[PDB]
Amino acid sequence: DIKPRIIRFGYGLADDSPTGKASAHFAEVVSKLSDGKMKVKTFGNGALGPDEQLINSLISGSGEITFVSTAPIASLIPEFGVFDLPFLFDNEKVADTVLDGPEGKKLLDKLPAKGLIGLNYWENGFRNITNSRHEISKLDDIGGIKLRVMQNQVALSVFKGLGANAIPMPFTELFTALETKTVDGQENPLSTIQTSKFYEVQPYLTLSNHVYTPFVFLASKKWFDQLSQDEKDVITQAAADSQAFQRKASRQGNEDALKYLKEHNVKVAEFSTEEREKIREKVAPIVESLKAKIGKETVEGVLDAAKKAS
Ligand SMILES: O=C(O)[C@H](O)[C@@H](O)[C@H](O)CO
Structure with a gap:
């Protein structure tokens, strides 16, 4: 039960950032899992506005999918401000464990009351x-x-x-x-x-x-709720695949960036x-x-x- 659908995915980072490439990966997986019926269109480099606007577009329904840092979510849900405290996470393994565990889920569970679905956490990273x-x-x-x-x-x-x-x-x-x-x-x-x-x-x-910043990978609840369960499953399955891809790409990207900046x-x-x-x-x-x-x-x-x- 999957009907043709076009899905807009704006974001703030450059399209060739690790998370930009993970957004294209998400698009590819959604297309694969839906036999090409669900097509994700990515708009990087802030083409659809910054996090604050992206959040508002998902709440309104002008946009479907985005990733944003946790910090602007604190303006809706103050508990998300926790991640702007310094030296919270000693390393990325700790971060993954906490975010994917109950403390991360408690925060994601506050999103639906504001019209958002937290599909899972992606890695922005150490600042x-x-x-x-x-x-x-x-x-x-x-x-x-x-x-x-x-x-x-x-x-x-x-x-x-x-x-x-x-x-x-x-x-x-x-x-x-x-x-x-x-x-x-x-x-x-x-x-x-x-x-x-x-x-x-x-x-x-x-x-x-x-500071370590999580991204939240977000869906518009108004949009997500009108999907069939088969279509929701495409989104959540693709989100799980893309989280793993994202985190690996982010960590390799961190290594590559250090090398590049030093060599420059x-x-x-x-x-x-x-x-x-x-x-x-x-x-x-x-x-x-x-x-x-x-x-x-x-x-x-x-x-x-x-x-x-x-
Ligand atoms: O400095 C910031 O604002 C964050 O680190 C970015 O990733 C931001 O989310 C982006 O769109």
Whole structure:
């Protein structure tokens, strides 16, 4: 029971980012599983707007499928803000375990009340600081930097607490803000820095890996609910296949991006062991400060699940 259907899948990252390629993979699997009857059309590079607009399009029904970072979802469901706390996940194995386990599912289960289906989590990844003002290799080097952040109170409060002038902006405005130096820098995974070309306007890169961002792979509930069960199964089966593809592509992409940026002579710094402890000390009270704006039980449950996975 599958009828011909065209499905629009907009997203913010470049079409040749790992997640852009995973979106094309999803399209291919949907076509395969539906004998070519269900056709997914991908619109990358922010062609259908940034995350905030994509979310709204799924709620309204103008769009069917997207992936977005968890951070803009915090404007609908504050508990999703948990992932903007620094150093939550020691590595990607911990992340997968927590996200695919009960603590991840509790959050996904809050989406339908807002008109969204969280099909599963994809990997945005560990975020790294870039800027055009000066090298950042110490906590103090962040003071007064105008740093674009994602658009929720947790991200703004974290970087303000680290001394930055935190400037929330949609991802789709970011390259130009960097190029014109309306902001000094930003922070994102290496493959995004590469495929969105931020290195062309960001001479400095710090391998801070300070935050891990999940993507949520999303379907419009209004749209999903009017699918037949056979068609829903195509979507959920393709989503499971594509998650595995995505995560592998993301992790290979992270390795490839580091190699590329280094070989391109981007200037790369890190936080020494001492500076790392300074950052940990400064973060701990702002993390505690933000539990009330995320949800105490969410923060503590994610932290406990991460400990058990680590
Ligand atoms: O910096 C950001 O906003 C995120 O990292 C991106 O992936 C964003 O979701 C994209 O569309």
